[PDB]
Amino acid sequence: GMTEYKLVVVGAGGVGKSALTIQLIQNHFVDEYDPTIEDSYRKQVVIDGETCLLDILDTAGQEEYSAMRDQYMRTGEGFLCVFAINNTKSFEDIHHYREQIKRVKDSEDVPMVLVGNKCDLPSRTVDTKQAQDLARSYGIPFIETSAKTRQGVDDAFYTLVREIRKH
Ligand SMILES: C=C(F)C(=O)N1CCN(c2nc(OC[C@@H]3CCCN3C)nc3c2CCN(c2cccc4cccc(Cl)c24)C3)C[C@@H]1CC#N
Ligand SMILES: Nc1nc2c(ncn2[C@@H]2O[C@H](COP(=O)(O)OP(=O)(O)O)[C@@H](O)[C@H]2O)c(=O)[nH]1
Ligand SMILES: [Zn+2]
Ligand SMILES: [Zn+2]
Ligand SMILES: [Zn+2]
Structure with a gap:
């Protein structure tokens, strides 16, 4: 059977919601x-x-x-x-x-x-440890992605599917 997973991408304008999805x-x-x-x-x-x-x-x-x-x-x-x-x-x-x-x-x-x-960009202002700590405080996975090099794109969405399976 084919299970559907309804996923919603949110985040500030310009963060890459559309580039990640495409x-x-x-x-x-x-x-x-x-x-x-x-x-x-x-x-x-x-x-x-x-x-x-x-x-x-x-x-x-x-x-x-x-x-x-x-x-x-x-x-x-x-x-x-x-x-x-x-x-x-x-x-x-x-x-x-x-x-x-x-x-x-x-x-x-x-x-x-x-x-x-x-994450392809050199000029980083948000440390990974800072993002890991936030995600930890929320009980959610954190993943770094680059829509430009495609690093982590599939895994960000698949990780979300595995979180939906948890609930
Ligand atoms: C190109 C762009 F500009 C751009 O892409 N968007 C900027 C404008 N949009 C939004 N902006 C801000 O708040 C922006 C700032 C942050 C603090 C308050 N605001 C001053 N909040 C929302 C939206 C979309 C609608 N919405 C939601 C409404 C109702 C229910 C929701 C439930 C769950 C999640 C959401 Cl998300 C819901 C909340 C769209 C998008 C961003 C997204 N997602
Ligand atoms: N260098 C780099 N630029 C990106 C990446 N993802 C998106 N962008 C750029 O960021 C800008 C906003 O992307 P967009 O997908 O429209 O963001 P959205 O408003 O959240 O949908 C675009 O000009 C993209 O070229 C990325 O992973 N790396
Ligand atoms: Zn549907
Ligand atoms: Zn608010
Ligand atoms: Zn967009």
Whole structure:
């Protein structure tokens, strides 16, 4: 049978939500992708021998909290919380995204992975130890990714699937 996993990618504008998603879906680094466009993608994949369908929401658009937006985000079974390792503000914004995730899921235990993207970049401002400690305090995995070199892309999404399996 084919289990679907509904995944939602969140994180500050410009951290790489779209580039990560396209790199998963299309196996290409797209260095300019409309920052406003929010879309969803299906990909049949095999994770630990399980054939599954990833249904991935690449969050975009504007910050608003209508009932329609809440209902779409609430269908998410697991969330990628993405920051950029060269952007300390995007790391600090993880608090707000985890806050919104918990709100719509009405749960203090939501499958989540903390994703530190742009690990190909030399000019890093967020230490790995700092991101590891945050993820540890939340009980979630941390993974560094580069949508540009594709390092960790599959594993960030697969790790999220394994967290969804846990709950
Ligand atoms: C190109 C870009 F600009 C760009 O890509 N976006 C910037 C604008 N978006 C958002 N921004 C901020 O807050 C930005 C800052 C941080 C502190 C407060 N705000 C001042 N918060 C949200 C959004 C999207 C909608 N939303 C959510 C609404 C309702 C329910 C949710 C449940 C779970 C998770 C979410 Cl995420 C929910 C929260 C979209 C995207 C970012 C994403 N994700
Ligand atoms: N160097 C590098 N740049 C990246 C990476 N991921 C995204 N970018 C760049 O960061 C910018 C914003 O990426 P985007 O996917 O649109 O971020 P989004 O707003 O979160 O969807 C783009 O110009 C990308 O070229 C990465 O892993 N490494
Ligand atoms: Zn985007
Ligand atoms: Zn679906
Ligand atoms: Zn908030």
